[PDB]
Design a binder for these strands. Structure first.
Lengths: 151, 117, 66, 70
RNA sequence: UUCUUCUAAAAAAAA
RNA sequence: AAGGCGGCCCCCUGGACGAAGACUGACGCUCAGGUGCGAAAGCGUGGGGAGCAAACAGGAUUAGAUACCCUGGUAGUCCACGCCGUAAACGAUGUCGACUUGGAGGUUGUGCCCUUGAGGCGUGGCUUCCGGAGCUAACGCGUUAAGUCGACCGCCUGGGGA
């Protein structure tokens, strides 16, 4: 806000793998405070992702995430009479937040039976460089490219 | 395409657009490109990035003449006052002389009236 | 810090190109009095001399006219 | 404002020298001044106002140099 | 860059 | 004197200021009526017309847009000779003269001391800002007065109508 930049709050890592960003992922995925249900969904999705990828769950999750992380995004400035979408580079924490949020919102729109299956399919397509999440990534990249003139 | 070693680069940098034109030492144009013709229109085409892209397009459009040395004549005020010069240096040309050729009258014709915005 | 009042010269001679070149910029413009520190009377005389030289083609009007 | 790049000299410092030479010679200000027509009354009033500010700031500095702020 | 207008009724203290 | 006057050169020409004297000897100041000069726009006659630009046309903005913004564009702006005689023609302060503390400059002469370098000490003309007494409703004016006086002229008597 205006006066003080607050200090970053700590998050304890997930029990099964001890990862910080995976714990962040389950926090993003959770709805109505049901962390246990969210944990079951992500664990099932990772366990089937391990089979489809042949790699460990952490490495597969990370390679799937890397194809969804943006590097530049547009932010409104409006110094002129119209909306100026200025492309600004994205810091890593916000990059991870955007990637995880896009993956979750894409999985919530897929039409598969379970959320675990939806998330597993979305992660596999993301690793395979396909899907609406990476489509959103290319769209924001294309917008930042088209508006690259302002800096 | 008769090869030429050294040339002159005229940058007509106006407020609404910029024109880059490479030529021989006698003033016969070889190629040209503009920010308005480089896929930018309106607000975008009056920015230094559009100007540098226009400079790159013009430098690419004069490759067949094999120019190495280049002296620059800059004319007019604009955002693309120096970005085009940077893009020309980065395109592989040896900038020898930089000159400003902006025309200023010695109290000649009467300019148009002031815009009441 | 006016050189002309230091030498106490009666009037500035327009044929003295060697001294006149020190009071013009590379673009051919006249350097302001407040910068070069010349007294106003000699500044006017200097301006008249520079214009007379320009008419006589001893000095350039601008650096670009060729 | 002619600037001829000398041997063993970077392009960026050459560009900086050209920019410095241009702002010394005052071409940008001159073109922006002559972009539109300015009436004799307006330019006289503007020069008068400019002189007033150029004298007032000097006097203001002279008064502020005496007193203290704490 | 554009961004107009609000009719017609109020009351206020006195060593 | 005011309106106003900006490249350079020549011809004709008005006013102002400085230092030493010499000269005429109140010849002076103001001025109703009168006369002359008087920005810009406009008019007549004859030229000239690049840029700018009332009117006008088209394109935008808008509910509308006979405007602001954009693209063109005619009188006009320019020259010669007359007419018009008006402006926030302003310092919103009529002209002339005398007296009343000062400071920092700008511009233009001129005298003295060793110009012991572009130094120091005076004395005139024009002009900018600050400020003391005093004046003023206040803001401010303040030796270039709106201070203290004298001579003459023009003008004002509630707002609207005007």
């Amino acid at each position: 806000p205006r006066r003080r930049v607050i200090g970053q709050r700590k998050i304890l890592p997930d029990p099964k793998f001890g990862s910080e960003l995976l714990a962040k992922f389950v926090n993003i995925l959770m709805v109505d405070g049901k962390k246990s249900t969210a944990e079951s969904i992500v664990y099932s999705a990772l366990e089937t992702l391990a089979q489809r990828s042949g790699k460990s769950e952490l490495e597969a999750f990370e390679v799937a995430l890397e194809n969804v992380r943006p590097t530049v995004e547009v932010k409104s400035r409006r110094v002129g009479g119209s909306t100026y979408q200025v492309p600004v580079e994205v810091r890593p924490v916000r990059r991870n937040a955007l990637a995880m949020r896009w993956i979750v919102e894409a999985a919530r729109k897929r039409g598969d039976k379970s959320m675990a299956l939806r998330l597993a399919n979305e992660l596999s397509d993301a690793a395979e460089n396909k899907g609406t999440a990476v489509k959103k990534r290319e769209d924001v990249h294309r917008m930042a490219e088209a508006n690259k003139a302002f800096a | 395409r008769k090869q030429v070693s050294d040339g002159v680069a005229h940058i007509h940098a106006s407020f609404n657009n910029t024109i880059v034109t490479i030529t021989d030492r006698q003033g016969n144009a070889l190629g040209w490109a503009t920010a308005g013709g480089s896929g930018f229109r309106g607000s975008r085409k009056s920015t230094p990035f559009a100007a540098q892209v226009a400079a790159e397009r013009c430098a690419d459009a004069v490759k067949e003449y094999g120019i190495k040395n280049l002296e620059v004549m800059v004319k007019g005020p604009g955002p693309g006052r120096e970005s085009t010069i940077r893009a020309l240096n980065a395109a592989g040309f040896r900038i020898t002389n930089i000159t400003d050729v902006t025309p200023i009258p010695h109290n000649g014709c009467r300019p148009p009236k002031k815009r009441r915005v | 810090f006016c050189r002309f009042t230091a030498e106490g010269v009666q009037e500035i001679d327009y044929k003295d190109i060697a001294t006149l070149k020190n009071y013009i910029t590379e673009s051919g413009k006249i350097v302001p009095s407040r910068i070069t520190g010349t007294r106003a009377k000699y500044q006017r005389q200097l301006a008249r001399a520079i214009k007379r030289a320009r008419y006589l083609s001893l000095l350039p009007y601008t650096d670009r006219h060729q | 404002p002619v600037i001829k790049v000398r041997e063993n000299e970077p392009f960026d410092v050459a560009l900086r020298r050209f920019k410095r030479s241009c702002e010394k010679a005052g071409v940008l200000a001159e073109v922006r001044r002559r972009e539109f027509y300015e009436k004799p009354t307006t330019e006289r009033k503007r020069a008068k106002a400019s002189a007033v500010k150029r004298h007032a700031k000097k006097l203001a500095r002279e008064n502020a140099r005496r007193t203290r702020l704490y």
